[PDB]
């Protein structure tokens, strides 16, 4: 083990650790033994809890979609009627995760996903149904299904997952780059043009994940919500940054309200305890 503090007695000297200049940008380490007399004592601590790996290594809900088992209607696309529901992958959707990731400029990790489906029947259904849910990963450039039963669902090359409602799926996805780390922020454009979109949305090309109820139409509508959780593994990050203080507005943007609420609470006086 290591010491938290080393016994130190009263000093009268020329060396003054208590005086410095923050103008240098340094935050030179000091200890209690520099200001006060101290007893020798052990840390009894490793810092394991504070490792980056443990911090970003807990699963978090990323996104929730809804798909239904319903008789297709001739007048609506199978996306208008939720027979099929293609999520564009972006961990920024559910902002608790977003902040934890935004604390770093560049982040690299393998992903682990857990997908959980739950059904409900708000209608007059006479029985429950443990519907089979299909998830399909659609890389950028890959075909986007038009119909709940389209040819695209064959998943000839697309990774796919089948699981039942009430069950869950779990799988790993290796770091997808294309760069050496994921960018949390991007101070730039896709190209040199005045009207080009600005920000990380430029780089976020992780594709999309399509969800479907595999089962054919029953005699009633069934609503299924699918929750996607994400956990990072083998996590590395670079260039830490200050956490966002203001409420987020939109995915991939750092925008905030025109007249934001100051995060800092106030008090009657600087002298109030």
């Amino acid at each position: 083990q290591t010491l938290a503090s080393i016994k130190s007695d009263s000093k009268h000297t020329q060396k003054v650790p208590s005086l410095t200049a923050n103008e240098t940008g340094a935050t030179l380490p000091t200890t209690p033994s520099d200001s006060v007399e101290t007893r020798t004592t052990l840390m009894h601590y490793t810092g394991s809890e504070t490792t980056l790996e443990n911090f970003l290594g807990r699963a978090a809900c990323v996104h929730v979609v809804e798909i239904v088992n319903k008789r297709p209607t001739d007048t609506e696309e199978h996306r208008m009627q939720l027979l099929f529901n293609n999520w564009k992958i972006n961990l920024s959707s559910l902002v608790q995760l977003r902040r934890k990731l935004e604390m770093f400029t560049y982040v690299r990790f393998d992903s682990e996903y857990t997908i959980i489906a739950t059904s409900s029947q708000p209608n007059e259904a006479k029985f429950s149904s443990n519907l089979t849910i299909q998830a399909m990963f659609i890389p950028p450039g890959a075909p986007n299904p038009k119909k709940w039963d389209d040819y695209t669902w064959q998943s000839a090359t697309n990774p796919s997952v089948f699981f039942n409602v009430g069950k869950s799926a779990r799988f790993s996805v290796p770091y997808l780059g294309i760069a050496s780390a994921y960018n949390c922020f991007y101070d730039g454009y896709s190209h040199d043009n005045s009207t080009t979109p600005y920000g990380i949305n430029v780089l976020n090309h992780m594709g999309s994940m399509a969800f479907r109820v595999v089962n054919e139409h029953d005699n009633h509508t069934t609503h299924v919500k699918v929750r996607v959780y994400h956990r990072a593994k083998h996590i590395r990050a670079w260039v830490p940054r200050a956490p966002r203080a203001l409420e987020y507005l939109h995915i991939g943007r750092t925008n905030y309200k025109q007249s934001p609420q100051n995060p800092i609470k106030t008090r009657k006086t600087i002298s109030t305890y």
């Binding site: 450039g141 869950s168 779990r170 997808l176």
Partner: protein, 231 residues
Amino acid sequence: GLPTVLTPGSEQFLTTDDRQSPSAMPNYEPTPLIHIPGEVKNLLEIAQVDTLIPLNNTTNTTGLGMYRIPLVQNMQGEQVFGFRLYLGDGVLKTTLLGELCQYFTHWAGSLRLSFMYTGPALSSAKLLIAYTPPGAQGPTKRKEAMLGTHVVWDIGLQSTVVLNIPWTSGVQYRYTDPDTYTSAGFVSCWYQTSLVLPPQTQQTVYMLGFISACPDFKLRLMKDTQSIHQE
């Protein structure tokens, strides 16, 4: 009975998984394998084989016309052809390399183009083949084209020129699919001098464009193509 714990994902069907499974046909003895020519181990072996580019895919061009690049007479400094360089799209969409690459999300590594001059043995010409890295438009003039990566092709005894297009990228991988951010720039060809045919000869001559992967060509992540549909 060993205590066990089930985890999330139990009984899931994952199409990309790999597990052992019971044989439906115990003790079956497969037909012996005989030597068959042309064994393939990697798609990248195939990607390195030249195929034709339907470069002249212009409106009202039909049949094999799409694979013929016209060259003509007394043009000087003029553009022969040009296209935005896409891997899974543009004029390369239907090439072998293209179709192979349509099965992959990302691609890195150099490409090769080559051109075969099929005009009269008595003819001659010099062409400029040029590549313009991302971050610029055009070229619209030869003067711009010459500022990129280029080769001047002396259409003489040997009919074919090869241009290796280098991995001029600040990004380790580009997308196969059209993407502004990772676009690969442009390819163009200009008349360095002019097409010269024997005296009193007036005709269009052609060249064929080819494409293949370089040995350093890389493909990173498999996906379905958009080049097929089914009812």
